[PDB]
């Protein structure tokens, strides 16, 4: 929907930009912001949850050529490395593809919440905005943002500007 | 006048906690144990031919 | 009795994919892991009902 995203939004991570009679203005939705954060936070905490301890291991550098045992000590440690390396590449990749879809869904979800709220008093413009079909002054706007907009109130006004 | 129809899912009085990517604990309707944690303390003589070096 | 997995600690059933009894095993056995419990979810998120 939103082709783009807003620079200069520093109140939070997701927000509302309105335009009415009283003028334009902006404001962030803190709840769906923290919702994204809390997930990234916890995901991140699980990744860096403190690793293993290891003490006396095998030797991994060698001065002289010993043949068979040394070939094996080097093969064991290389095999280890290659695997752990794969684990880390895959981890990050998965975690990231998720962290993206997580945050794209958060925006997405806020939009729907807002659409179900307006019920039949507004239409989706196509770029992730709403054309609200009534006089929605600044009190009314925050009433939407903070989850209290009663549609049953502006129904008649809106419904009629929409249809004839 | 009109009518109301609601879509819903179940839930249960005592769930079980499990882990996910994002979440350390999260209650779900049911889960299952994947790690065999205890033993019978004795060795079964089948189907493997056991021989006791006494 | 019948048991396709043997350990020093005794015989264990291999109905699970992992085990925590002993790293020494013989036969068709679950893979030894350091974890003593891993719960796999077999149902949806459990949500109690709102109120009123």
């Amino acid at each position: 929907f939103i082709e783009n995203g807003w620079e200069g939004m520093i109140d939070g991570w997701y927000g509302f930009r309105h335009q009415n009679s009283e003028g334009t203005g902006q404001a962030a939705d803190l709840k769906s912001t923290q919702a994204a954060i809390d997930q990234i936070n916890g995901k991140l905490n699980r990744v860096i949850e403190k690793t293993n301890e290891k003490f006396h291991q095998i030797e991994k550098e060698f001065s002289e050529v010993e043949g068979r045992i040394q070939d094996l000590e080097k093969y064991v440690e290389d095999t280890k490395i290659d695997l752990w390396s794969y684990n880390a590449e895959l981890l990050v990749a998965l975690e990231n593809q998720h962290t993206i879809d997580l945050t794209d869904s958060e925006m997405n979800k806020l939009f729907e919440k807002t659409r179900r709220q307006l019920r039949e008093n507004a239409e989706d413009m196509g770029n992730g905005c709403f054309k609200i079909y009534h006089k929605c002054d600044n009190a009314c706007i925050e009433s939407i943002r903070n989850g209290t907009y009663d549609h049953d109130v502006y129904r008649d006004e809106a419904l009629n500007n929409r249809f004839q | 006048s009109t009518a109301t129809l609601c879509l819903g899912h179940h839930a249960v009085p005592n769930g079980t906690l499990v882990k996910t990517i994002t979440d350390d604990q999260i209650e779900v309707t049911n889960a299952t144990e994947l790690v065999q944690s205890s033993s019978t303390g004795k060795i079964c003589n089948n189907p493997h031919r056991i021989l006791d070096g006494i | 009795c019948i048991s396709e997995c043997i350990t020093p600690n005794g015989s264990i059933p291999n109905d699970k994919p992992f085990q925590n009894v002993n790293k020494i095993t013989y036969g068709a056995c679950p893979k030894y892991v350091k974890q003593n419990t891993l719960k796999l979810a077999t149902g949806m998120r459990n949500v109690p009902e709102k109120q009123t």
Epitope: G12, L30, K31, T33, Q34, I37, I40, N41, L44, N45, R46, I48, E49, K50 | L17, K19, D24, Q25 | Q35, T37
Partner: antibody, heavy 126, light 108 residues
Framework: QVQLVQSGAEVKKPGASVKVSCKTS????????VSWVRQAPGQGPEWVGW????????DYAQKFQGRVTLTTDATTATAFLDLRSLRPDDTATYFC???????????????????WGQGTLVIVSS | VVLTQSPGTLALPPGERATLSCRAS???????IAWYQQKSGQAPRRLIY???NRATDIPDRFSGSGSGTDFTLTIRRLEPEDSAVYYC?????????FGQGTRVEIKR
């Protein structure tokens, strides 16, 4: 510096309810939630609930749900705790404490119950 | 998520080592554990966060550790200052829960 001054001991009778204040200072009120823990004399602490001063979100312990209401006043920088239908069970000392970090980057868990109220006694007797 | 911690009380002389355990009924991130000390009257004072780290202004006698289900707090060389109750707490899973409480009496 950073502190949490709670209200003085109240005394209430089996039916009634109660409200306890927790005044904060020395840190920006809105980037951190508040946790509430109570303590029946001689027993150990049990958790009551948590409220975010950033998002207004709450999580009550399911033991109390219904009876308990957490709120915050950003102007005075104070968290409040309202408990209704007081049983004599609820006779305890009630603590508030800073908890979770909100808005800000993230982690790990550096508090998470950094600093605590001096405690505030509630007696439910007839 | 139940934290049963042991031993009940324990009495040890000054300059000895108390070793407190905290077994949890379910597995828990090492990051969502905390330990507290409480001398009766005053409010709980927080020793350790994330299972491993000291909060500030805390002597290094105090230290913590644990993996998944067994968390432990070690006071490395006791003082008479340390006679108190100690609580482990987890806040991974609502309801955030506390331990039974291990008492420490110094045995003079």
């Amino acid at each position: 510096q950073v502190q949490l001054v709670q209200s003085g001991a109240e005394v209430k009778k089996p039916g009634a309810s109660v409200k306890v204040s927790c005044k904060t200072s020395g840190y920006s009120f809105s980037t951190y939630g508040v946790s509430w823990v109570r303590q029946a004399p001689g027993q150990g602490p049990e958790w009551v609930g948590w409220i975010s001063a950033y998002t207004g979100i709450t999580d009550y312990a399911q033991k109390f749900q219904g009876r308990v209401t957490l709120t915050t006043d950003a102007t005075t920088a104070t968290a409040f705790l309202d408990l209704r239908s007081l049983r004599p069970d609820d006779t305890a000392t009630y603590f508030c404490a800073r908890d979770k970090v909100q808005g800000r980057v993230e982690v790990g868990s550096g508090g998470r119950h950094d600093y605590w109220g001096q405690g505030t006694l509630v007696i439910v007797s007839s | 998520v139940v934290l049963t911690q042991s031993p009940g009380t324990l009495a040890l002389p000054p300059g000895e080592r108390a070793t407190l355990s905290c077994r949890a009924s379910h597995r828990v991130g090492s990051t969502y554990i905390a330990w507290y000390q409480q001398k009766s009257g005053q409010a709980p004072r927080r020793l350790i966060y994330g299972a491993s780290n000291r909060a500030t202004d805390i002597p290094d006698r105090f230290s913590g550790s644990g993996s998944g289900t067994d968390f432990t707090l070690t006071i490395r060389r006791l003082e008479p200052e340390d006679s108190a109750v100690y609580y482990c707490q987890q806040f991974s899973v609502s309801p955030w829960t506390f331990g039974q409480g291990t008492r420490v009496e110094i045995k003079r």
